[PDB]
């Protein structure tokens, strides 16, 4: 059934699994019209499909053209997400296909189940985890490839850069969720923490800066402080 704190190590076992987050698929700016009504303008979005063990990110860029002349877009967005995940699975060799797909939002369950009927042995699961994958568009290089897209495109990243050379997947996922939680809570302050020291750069082939093990501990501390500071501000506690 549902994935929670009780079965957390399951993410890092040897059964191929993907998280699917649909929160950035349908994105809009709301604005006033000349007549003083309100209208939306879609911008490019993305499906965030992540192997938590390997760090492999299948970023399917959703170009605004996919919404043209469609109705009920927030509903269609879930079905288009399911379509594209189904297509990705069918494109993978059998030995690379997931055994489980975990959706970050329960509204994705029926659409993904219906699109994957041909894969009865792939389990579709919700999670009780509150995962900050909505903040993926706060990673500059992922935001850049989405906003520049002029057509539908799939881009493959490793969201852990080279971390798995030095740390386990459990630790790499813990670092990724803390970074994204911080970016979600106070984007400006998080990016300041990540980039404030010019001597530490982002490799052309990476998403995050090239921190030494000691620098990652300092960074991780500053991120936890940011999240506690912001929590003290929200609740005045």
């Amino acid at each position: 059934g549902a994935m929670n704190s009780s079965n957390y190590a399951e993410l890092f076992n040897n059964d191929i699994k993907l998280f699917v987050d649909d929160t950035n698929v349908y994105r809009v700016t709301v604005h006033k019209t000349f007549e003083g009504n309100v209208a939306t303008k879609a911008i490019n979005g993305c499906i965030f499909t992540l192997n938590p063990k390997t760090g492999h990110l299948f970023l399917k860029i959703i170009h605004t053209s996919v919404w043209a002349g469609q109705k009920r877009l927030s509903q269609l967005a879930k079905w288009k997400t399911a379509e594209e995940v189904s297509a990705l699975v069918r494109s993978l060799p059998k030995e690379e296909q997931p055994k489980q797909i975990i959706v970050t939002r329960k509204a994705m369950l029926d659409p993904l189940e219906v699109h994957m009927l041909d894969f009865p042995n792939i389990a579709i699961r919700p999670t009780e985890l509150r995962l900050p994958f909505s903040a993926a568009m706060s990673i500059d290089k992922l935001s850049d490839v989405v906003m520049k897209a002029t057509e539908p495109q799939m881009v493959l990243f490793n969201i852990y850069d080279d971390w798995l050379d030095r740390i386990s997947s459990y630790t790499a996922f813990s670092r990724l969720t803390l970074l994204l939680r911080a970016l979600k809570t106070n984007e400006e302050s998080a990016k300041m923490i990540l980039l404030s020291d010019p001597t530490i750069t982002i490799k052309s082939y990476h998403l995050w800066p090239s921190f030494t093990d000691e620098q990652w501990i300092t960074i991780e501390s500053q991120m936890r402080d940011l999240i506690l500071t912001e929590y003290g501000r929200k609740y005045n506690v």
Partner: protein, 300 residues
């Protein structure tokens, strides 16, 4: 007007005939039911006074043979049997009638309730759902599972209702996933009506049979089937006008007949709220919505 004589009533039992019921005491001179209306299926059903576990009964049509009930002290149930000797049967029935040892099927002349519950139900379709081809009547009880319940265990004692599953390849055309899931018209009209049932009469017959097994036996699988067939129609944007008008009539009489004290176990809140208030057909079931709102406003 036909007769189902009883050999005897050796155990205290509540006897149902269609929507009617009579209490018979242990060794009471009860010898059956006369004046049964020709032209309809009927159900004769039983609940023992000393063990209310297992309601059970027999669907039959007196046009197909001469049927009687005889208690089996080994298997501990009232069994239906067919008498092949016409003259023996006629002679038994005449004697019991002469001695007034039979209850009369108590039909009020104004009252179309049974016709209205069984309009599309045909003995030949019952015998394909309930498979026991050596008998012309069909045994059903409280505990019998459906083919669909058995997929999710003795196949011979199963109710072979048509399997309906909204998240199945049968229900969903490759390439029309969202369309077919949110609008079940394809599944209703092409797969089920054109494909399996051949026409709306056979679909309604199964729907009506499922309701009656749910109501008279508390058969849980039957209740699931009745709701699934209602939900398939209500979840279809494209349904023939005559089917919606007929469905409204079918459901009205089912809701009218349902004992008020059983609504909590026989009616699925989700399905009824969806069908009446959210579905494509939310505005197509005037009679049903009115009786449901006046009789069962708590459920909604």
């Amino acid at each position: 007007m036909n007769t189902v004589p009883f050999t005897s009533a050796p155990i205290e039992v509540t006897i149902g005939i269609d929507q009617y019921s009579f209490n018979v005491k242990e060794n009471q001179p009860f010898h059956g039911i006369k004046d049964i209306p020709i032209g309809h299926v009927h159900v004769i059903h039983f609940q023992h006074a000393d063990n209310s576990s297992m309601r059970y009964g027999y669907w039959f049509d007196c046009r197909m043979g001469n049927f009687y009930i005889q208690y089996d002290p080994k298997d501990g149930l009232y069994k239906m049997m067919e008498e092949r000797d016409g003259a023996k049967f006629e002679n038994i029935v005449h004697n019991f009638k002469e001695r007034q040892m039979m209850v009369s099927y108590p039909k009020i002349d104004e009252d179309d309730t049974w016709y209205n519950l069984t309009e599309f139900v045909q003995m030949d379709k019952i015998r394909k759902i309930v498979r026991k081809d050596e008998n012309q009547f069909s045994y059903v009880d409280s505990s019998m599972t459906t083919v669909q319940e058995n997929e999710l265990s003795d196949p011979a004692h199963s109710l072979n209702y048509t399997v309906i599953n909204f998240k199945s390849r049968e229900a969903i055309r490759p390439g029309h996933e969202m369309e077919d899931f949110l609008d079940k018209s394809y599944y209703l009209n092409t797969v089920m009506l054109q494909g399996i049932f051949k026409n709306s009469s056979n679909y309604f017959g199964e729907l009506q049979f499922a309701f009656l097994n749910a109501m008279f036996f508390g058969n849980y699988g039957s209740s699931l089937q009745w709701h699934a067939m209602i939900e398939l129609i209500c979840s279809s944007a494209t349904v023939p006008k005559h089917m919606l008008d007929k469905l409204d009539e079918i459901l009205y009489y089912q809701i009218k007949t349902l004992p008020e004290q059983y609504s909590d176990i026989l009616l699925n809140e989700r399905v009824w709220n969806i069908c009446l208030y959210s579905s494509f057909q939310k505005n197509s079931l005037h009679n049903t919505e009115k009786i449901m709102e006046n009789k069962y406003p708590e459920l909604l």
